[PDB]
Amino acid sequence: TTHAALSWNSLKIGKSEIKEFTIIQATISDSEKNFRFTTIVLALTLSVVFSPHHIGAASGKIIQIFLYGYGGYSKVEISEVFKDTNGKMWLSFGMLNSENSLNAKIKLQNTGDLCSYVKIKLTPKAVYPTMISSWQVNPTELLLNPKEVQWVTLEFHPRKEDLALLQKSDVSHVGTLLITHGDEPTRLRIRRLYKKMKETGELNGNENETFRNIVHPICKVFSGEQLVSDVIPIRDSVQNFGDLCREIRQHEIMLTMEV
Amino acid sequence: IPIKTTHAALSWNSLKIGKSEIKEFTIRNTSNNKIKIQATISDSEKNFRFLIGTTIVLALQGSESRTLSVVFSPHHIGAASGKIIFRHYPSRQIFLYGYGGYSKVEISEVFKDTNGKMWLSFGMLNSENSLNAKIKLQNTGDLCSYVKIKLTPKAVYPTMISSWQVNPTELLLNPKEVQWVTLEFHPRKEDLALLQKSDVSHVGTLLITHGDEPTRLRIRRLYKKMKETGELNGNENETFRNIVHPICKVFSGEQLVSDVIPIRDSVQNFGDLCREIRQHEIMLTMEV
Amino acid sequence: IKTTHAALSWNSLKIGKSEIKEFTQATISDSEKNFSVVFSPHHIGAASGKIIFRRQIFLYGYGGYSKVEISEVFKDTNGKMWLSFGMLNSENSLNAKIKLQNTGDLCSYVKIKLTPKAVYPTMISSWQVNPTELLLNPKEVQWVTLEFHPRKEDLALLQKSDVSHVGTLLITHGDEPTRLRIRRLYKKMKETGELNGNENETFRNIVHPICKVFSGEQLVSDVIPIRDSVQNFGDLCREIRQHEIMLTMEVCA
Amino acid sequence: KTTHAALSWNSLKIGKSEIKEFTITLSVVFSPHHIGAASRQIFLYGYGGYSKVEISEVFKDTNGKMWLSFGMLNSENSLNAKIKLQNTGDLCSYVKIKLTPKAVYPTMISSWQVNPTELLLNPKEVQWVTLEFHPRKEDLALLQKSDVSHVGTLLITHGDEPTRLRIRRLYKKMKETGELNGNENETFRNIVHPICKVFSGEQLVSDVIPIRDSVQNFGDLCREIRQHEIMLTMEV
């Protein structure tokens, strides 16, 4: 057995993903009957399917080898922004009135069944020491329960120094808003696993230049995090950690401004 | 006066007050003798000048020839007609035409990207319903403005346009006039069959040709004169006709202004006159 | 008894792949066991059938595909194709080429149309493209050459930016048999003049230059026993693949 | 009180002049007569010349984006490509480059091999930057859906080498006194820190030492930091 255990990502009800493991009687000792092939025999690459019947955790046993899954999903839909046929997302503040500053809002809708996590990070195009002081965006980070609606409001007080670069064109790219979102439990799983790997020192050299910067703002305890104990019996490992980071959803709304 | 100009006349486009356009023409002596001629611009409204004042003089030595440049600055909105006279220092005459004012049709309630495109979204297809949107057209100029709108669907079935309803298809806008263009789309099952794959689907493209109305009258007279002679019929005009043909039609509401009849345009100035036809292509999408 | 569809035709389907079409005690009569009704080509070629109510409704189909790949042109992650002429050398004109290869099993048809970004009456076209129209036998590869002679009217608008859009190359391609089918029915479309009012400007412009007799067109007689009609034409004209290539040119310095 | 005990310009092109206002209001003009530094009650600093860092052998868009394609993933092989970098300027150039892949997995940087990661170019020096991608199994799991896949983004921060020495001089003080020692700088440092390290081949020029720049004008000096992004494309 190459993989000591198999862990699936959070999957919506009525969808099944397969995963393989390389290796006598065989049987899935599952009480909730989430994992199937149900009981086989083979003489000497095996593949197991996962179909979440109930929203919630799923733990299975093969005659031993451990199987891990968790059912439900999260779909953060961004609204009141413009989306292109190509795919890119666009938010316009309007024209620059003298002696005034600009401000806008975004709507976030959770169309899933599980809790969702959202970390927002704003990056302006111009650079100067107080480049963070000109933008004020709130909430910077939050959680959304299923079918919850939240408005994120962002105010921009343009200084002369950024507009000195925004001068040239009539519609000026001023910044990019990155929204990292997804399901809350996968964040708990990756947080637990990252604490495990950092405590043992697996990733603390060079390969950690970019990776920490991608996983840092999500492994912290969020504000409003009501600790759910459904994810404590699921132990994920190093080999499947990439498949866990694959469910980190990221979108980059564009910020524009006319003349 | 042995002389042979290149341009029989010089005609300018439409220029804002306080803006000047230059145009040059090559004047050539034909006789192998020594001629010396005076060029005087008889301008009544101070619209045309030289490149100095209102009168110059030059000598030409046996086909030794030159290139003169004339500037145009329309002080008043309205037509401008002058004539340069070449006398000896018997007459030679070249006449000049220009017309002042401008038009700036501004499209509004549409989205503009940093790239340059303009984007209009209908929304999300609700079951048993159809979609609709609107755009604002504002004339911020000094002259009357002309707008021809033409819609091209993305799907290709024989009755593709009958699912689209666009109003107004063609119109004029006076300065500081506001007009709203309404677009209704009741999709047939054949339209959505391709839009399936993505979440935001391109459904059509709306072309808006706009500009100043009088230049349309000038281009219309020139296009009608040229089309009957067969000058503009063949291969090199496939794209040009398709942009300039639907605009030479008689518009609805066209109040015939007689200010452009004293302006004589020619074959030689047809390209730079048609280059000032402003054209934009709004995108039409939805989010299924 | 009465059927909203007196006949049922499909499009040209890939080998071994099935296409379903719905229509609204039960026996069928097909010769090559090809066939709500489902279609699967068991012989690479045309397909026919006459079902028997228990009283006849005619079914038609055609099997095969034509995958014409455009190469030596840059493709985008978003999906837009991009061709560059390079840089405007003084006293010279710019040139480029694209390759088109039919990686399918049926004949492919390719009509090319160019639209410049500059509009002006010169009567000597700065663009020279060859071949404007052609057809490809299976696995036939052809090169399309494009030459641009920049006159001052072209460069007068291309001045502002460093990378200038100079033209748009539309390639309408697909399988020859569906072109014969659409042309055959399109001739009858004109016998009644059914949609000449406003459709005449967006539909005819897309489907008329395809109904002309191509050069090299060797008349295949496999599409004559086919009886597709007006109602399925909307579906039949769906297999006209149309791609757009950008034409770009970098300005000096 | 004249709001600035010192006033610095940027590196200006040959023979073109830029005016700057300095309140007291007053306006002053600079024009470079010699490629090199420049120094009543007067206290002013400036320096003339330019470095045009041109990226070539990469496809550009009418919109302005840049695109590099590795070709198609042949089985059992790994992919590699190269870009040309030419200094069509008059002063030395600095070209700190960093690549960030589009796939998130713990060994991101190791699968990518890019050289040179750091270098500087004197005027009209031409260098080729090679970048090789060994597709690890985590990478292709995301690139499956479409036919043309975005695999990474390569940031090239380039500009004038001499202005970099001034930026380092000001940033070292600004951090030794802790003016900008906080964490909000996490978006600024990522933009300006990888250029303040000592490059290889850096021959210390002493022409930038008499240029006494201060805290307030740092923004204007760091305004001339050119930033381009190259898209990384893989077919199939």
Residue numbers in the entry:
A (entry chain B): 969 to 991, 1001 to 1014, 1023 to 1029, 1036 to 1054, 1072 to 1267
B (entry chain A): 965 to 1015, 1021 to 1058, 1069 to 1267
C (entry chain G): 967 to 990, 1002 to 1012, 1038 to 1056, 1071 to 1269
D (entry chain F): 968 to 991, 1036 to 1050, 1071 to 1267
Paper text:
Despite extensive efforts, we were unable to crystallize DmSP2D, but we were able to crystallize the SP2D from the honeybee Apis dorsata and solved its structure to a resolution of 3.5 Å. Although side-chain visibility at this resolution is partly limited, the structure allowed its comparison to the human SP2D structure to reveal the underlying conserved interactions. Both structures adopt a very similar overall fold (252 Cα pairs with an RMSD of 2.27 Å). Thus, the extended cradle arrangement of the two ASH domains appears to be a conserved and defining feature of the SP2D. In both humans and honeybees, the extended cradle structure is assembled around a large insertion in the second ASH domain of the SP2D that loops out of the main β-sandwich to form a “bridge” that interacts with the first ASH domain and helps to hold the two ASH domains in their stereotypical conformation. This insertion consists of a short helix (α1) that emerges from β-f of the β-sandwich and extends as a less well-structured region that wraps around α1, enclosing a cluster of hydrophobic residues that form a stabilizing core (highlighted in red labels). In HsSP2D, Gln1995 in the α1 helix forms salt bridge interactions with Ser1876 via a nitrate ion trapped in a cavity, whereas in the AdSP2D, Arg1197 in the α1 helix forms salt bridge interactions with the side chain of Asp1244 and with the backbone-carbonyl oxygen of Trp976. Thus, although the stereospecific orientation of the two ASH domains in the SP2D is highly conserved, the internal molecular interactions that ensure their orientation appear to have partly diverged between humans and honeybees. Intriguingly, a similar crystal-packing interaction interface involving F1090 and W1098 was observed in the Apis Spd-2 SP2D crystal structure (cyan).
Spd-2/CEP192 proteins, defined by a conserved “Spd-2 domain” (SP2D) comprising two closely spaced AspM-Spd-2-Hydin (ASH) domains, play a critical role in centrosome assembly. The conserved centriole/centrosome protein Spd-2/CEP192 (fly/human nomenclature) plays an important part in mitotic centrosome assembly in humans, flies, and worms and also in the diverged centrosomes of Dictyostelium, which lack canonical centrioles. In flies and worms, the phosphorylation of Spd-2/SPD-2 at centrioles recruits Polo/Polo-like kinase 1 (PLK1), which then phosphorylates the large coiled-coil protein Cnn/SPD-5 to stimulate the assembly of a Cnn scaffold, and the internal molecular interactions that allow Cnn and SPD-5 to assemble into scaffolds are beginning to be elucidated. ASH domains are present in several proteins associated with centrosomes, cilia, flagella, and the Golgi complex, but the functions of these domains remain largely unknown.
